[PDB]
């Protein structure tokens, strides 16, 4: 599985539906352009096509396909730009219900890369002397007070160009500066809670 699953689930009776939603949107990863390099990202148009096959039938609430750029600024500032975009997909109330974890997950998209560099959710694309390309795929599965009778699953595909060599990128902290070109793709999918008696790890 090439999406990092961030489970924010109050009742374990739903662990199974979240894994099942995760397993579904895995099929929404697509190849990047061979110019970007050799890499998979969650596609939002594909994710739409997948959500229609999902049974029991849910509803797609919001979606985004958007570029975000920075010129020699702090990583902290890309993290906040991307948070602003994801918060808009989640909306105010669902955001605040998961804000710490939403914050950590976008922080770890841009920093702490060295300890993540071999994991299945990151793909290293084209790497030159002054640029690194990578994709990073995460999926939030959320059931809590703000969610009532449904689960929300929010897949996100990042396609990232940052103006620094890989080894430097691997050790970036929020205090570093670089130039970025980030394309974000995400949807938010609601599905009625389906309870379960098998509880996967």
């Amino acid at each position: 599985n090439n999406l990092l699953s961030i489970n924010e689930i109050d009742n374990p009776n739903y662990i199974l539906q979240a894994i099942m939603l995760a397993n579904a949107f895995q099929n929404a990863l697509v190849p990047t352009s061979t110019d970007f390099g050799d890499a998979l990202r969650f596609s939002m148009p594909k994710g739409l096509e997948i959500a229609n096959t999902i049974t029991p039938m849910g509803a797609v609430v919001s979606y985004v396909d958007q570029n975000v750029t920075q010129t020699n600024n702090q990583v902290s500032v890309m993290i906040n730009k991307v948070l602003e975009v994801l918060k808009t997909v989640l909306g105010v109330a669902l955001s605040g219900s998961v804000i710490d974890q939403l914050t950590a997950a976008v922080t770890n998209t841009f920093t702490n890369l060295n300890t993540q560099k071999n994991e299945a959710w990151i793909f290293w694309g084209k790497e030159t002397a002054n640029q690194t390309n990578y994709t990073y795929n995460v999926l939030f599965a959320i059931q809590n007070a703000q969610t009532g009778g449904v689960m929300y699953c929010v897949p996100v595909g990042f396609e990232i160009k940052v103006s620094a060599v890989k080894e430097q990128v691997l050790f970036f902290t929020i205090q570093d500066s670089a130039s970025y070109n980030v394309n974000i793709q995400s949807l938010k999918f609601a599905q009625p809670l389906v309870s379960s008696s098998q509880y996967p790890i």
Side-chain angles (χ1 to χ4, degrees):
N1 208 101
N2 307 276
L3 296 146
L4 162 70
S5 291
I6 321 261
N7 293 330
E8 295 300 306
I9 282 148
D10 276 10
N11 196 327
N13 283 343
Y14 302 117
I15 292 164
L16 173 69
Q17 161 173 35
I19 286 162
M20 276 188 86
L21 292 170
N23 297 337
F25 294 105
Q26 169 71 11
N27 302 277
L29 307 192
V30 305
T32 50
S33 156
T34 68
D35 264 359
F36 172 94
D38 204 330
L40 304 167
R41 56 86 60 75
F42 176 72
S43 172
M44 119 38 221
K46 202 119 185 299
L48 294 179
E49 254 148 5
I50 293 297
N52 292 346
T53 74
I54 291 196
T55 232
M57 195 200 131
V60 175
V61 191
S62 52
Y63 42 82
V64 81
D65 181 358
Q66 190 181 334
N67 272 244
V68 158
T69 68
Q70 230 176 46
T71 300
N72 299 302
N73 215 317
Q74 212 147 242
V75 168
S76 197
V77 184
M78 202 16 96
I79 283 137
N80 296 318
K81 296 191 186 248
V82 163
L83 275 167
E84 278 301 290
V85 166
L86 297 176
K87 283 174 154 204
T88 303
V89 185
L90 270 70
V92 169
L94 191 58
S95 294
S97 72
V98 287
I99 191 63
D100 295 3
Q101 309 96 311
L102 174 63
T103 290
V106 181
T107 297
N108 293 327
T109 300
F110 291 96
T111 66
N112 260 105
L113 291 178
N114 178 251
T115 185
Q116 284 183 87
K117 48 179 183 195
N118 293 318
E119 304 293 332
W121 58 87
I122 181 172
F123 291 87
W124 290 104
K126 264 192 208 167
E127 74 194 69
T128 74
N130 65 348
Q131 200 169 119
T132 302
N133 297 349
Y134 65 103
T135 59
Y136 186 107
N137 309 106
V138 256
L139 176 159
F140 299 91
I142 317 182
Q143 169 281 132
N144 61 23
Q146 304 294 340
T147 276
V150 302
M151 176 165 296
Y152 294 96
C153 172
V154 191
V156 178
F158 294 106
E159 176 181 282
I160 302 161
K161 307 178 189 207
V162 50
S163 63
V165 287
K166 209 193 171 177
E167 67 277 6
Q168 284 175 40
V169 173
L170 289 185
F171 301 104
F172 275 4
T173 65
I174 62 163
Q175 305 285 126
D176 286 285
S177 331
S179 303
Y180 285 90
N181 246 275
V182 176
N183 177 253
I184 303 143
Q185 291 184 39
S186 178
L187 55 93
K188 169 172 63 171
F189 181 74
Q191 188 179 47
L193 286 173
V194 171
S195 181
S196 159
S197 83
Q198 178 233 170
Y199 297 89
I201 106 287

